[PDB]
Amino acid sequence: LTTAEYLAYQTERHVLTILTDMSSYADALREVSAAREEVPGRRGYPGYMYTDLSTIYERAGRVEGRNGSITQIPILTMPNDDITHPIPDLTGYITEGQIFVDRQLHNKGIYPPINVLPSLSRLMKSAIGEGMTRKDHGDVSNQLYAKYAIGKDAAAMKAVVGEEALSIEDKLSLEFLEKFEKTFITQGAYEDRTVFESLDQAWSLLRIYPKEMLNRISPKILDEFYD
Amino acid sequence: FPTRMTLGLMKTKLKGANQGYSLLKRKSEALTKRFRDITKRIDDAKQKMGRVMQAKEIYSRAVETLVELASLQTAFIILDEVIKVTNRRVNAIEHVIIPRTENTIAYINSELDELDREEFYRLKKVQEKKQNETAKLDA
Known part of the structure; x- marks a missing residue:
């Protein structure tokens, strides 16, 4: 962290910090707190850990007048595959947004299993729109989230109800969900795709659903790509 | 979880x-x-249609009612199939979903109660430690 700070405040360059197995660090801190015979918190964590964890999240951010940028991207393993744990809860509440990995999609055999439901980004606001990527960015993102959620509810419905995929809407929702899961969700590990390619792929993946089926898309966004 | x-x-x-x-x-x-x-x-319509089987006009007003009764019969069959699906859903909502939800709720309740018991035990140990330290300092 001090190396990244020295890189940002002196060398003036883009720096990216990454902490591996932060869960072990939290367990170690909990051990040090336990050895001190102090008041233990959730999962044996320290009481001042809130300030400690913040100090781990304070290794990011840029400065005024500095061309360089330091951004910390820590990584930890949620205990018993539970994001409800104090470590993941604090990490999610402190930092803006979190990347969640589903075990089922990883057990599917497909490429990287990111769950869009739990996953979110607070920096996706100012980084979207025209001048950055595209004006169709935010709209297609919200539409993707809505389609994924609708597909999830349609999946739960498909589990509870019959195999008829609950009439029409839920069928197209489930189809689009599976399609986005087998294509948009898995880009491959050795493949690097641009934003335009992903936008075109999403435009092709959204062709299965009707134009009036998207309530998350505005009039301009609906008239954006008819190609 | x-x-x-x-x-x-x-x-x-x-x-x-x-x-x-x-x-x-x-x-x-x-x-x-x-x-x-x-x-x-359907049985009554079967006997009715079986009454006259094997002339003049107006026969168009005869086979029509029989066609309606046939539609009612097919609708009755579809109703039987739908009733079967409903009975299957009821059977699936009886010993399957209910038992699974009950067992899951029981296990979750046990886990939560055990965790709360462990936390309360740790808190009691902390309070006992503080009380022991205070009793040691009091001397």
């Missing part, structure tokens, strides 16, 4: 499955009665 919110969602889904089970049961009963009446009507 063992959270109070998850327990609430599971309990809500369980209650909803119960109400849905009752509704599906009543619907199965009504469908059974309707299919029964339509069955008796």
Whole structure:
């Protein structure tokens, strides 16, 4: 962290910090707190850990007048595959947004299993729109989230109800969900795709659903790509 | 996995499955009665159509009613199939979903109670440690 700070405040360059197995660090801190015979918190964590964890999240951010940028991207393993744990809860509440990995999609055999439901980004606001990527960015993102959620509810419905995929809407929702899961969700590990390619792929993946089926898309966004 | 919110969602889904089970049961009963009446009507229509089988005009007003009765018969068969699906759904809402939800709720309750017991034990140990330290400093 001090190396990244020295890189940002002196060398003036883009720096990216990454902490591996932060869960072990939290367990170690909990051990040090336990050895001190102090008041233990959730999962044996320290009481001042809130300030400690913040100090781990304070290794990011840029400065005024500095061309360089330091951004910390820590990584930890949620205990018993539970994001409800104090470590993941604090990490999610402190930092803006979190990347969640589903075990089922990883057990599917497909490429990287990111769950869009739990996953979110607070920096996706100012980084979207025209001048950055595209004006169709935010709209297609919200539409993707809505389609994924609708597909999830349609999946739960498909589990509870019959195999008829609950009439029409839920069928197209489930189809689009599976399609986005087998294509948009898995880009491959050795493949690097641009934003335009992903936008075109999403435009092709959204062709299965009707134009009036998207309530998350505005009039301009609906008239954006008819190609 | 063992959270109070998850327990609430599971309990809500369980209650909803119960109400849905009752509704599906009543619907199965009504469908059974309707299919029964339509069955008796199907037998009556069978005897009626079997009355005259094997001349002048106006025969178009004859086979039409028989066609309507046939439509009622097919609708009765579809009603029987739908009643079967409803009965299957009721059977799936009885010993399957209900038992799974109950067992899951029980295990989750046990896990939560055990965790709370462990936390309370740790807190009691902390309080005992503080009390022991205070009693040691008092001397």
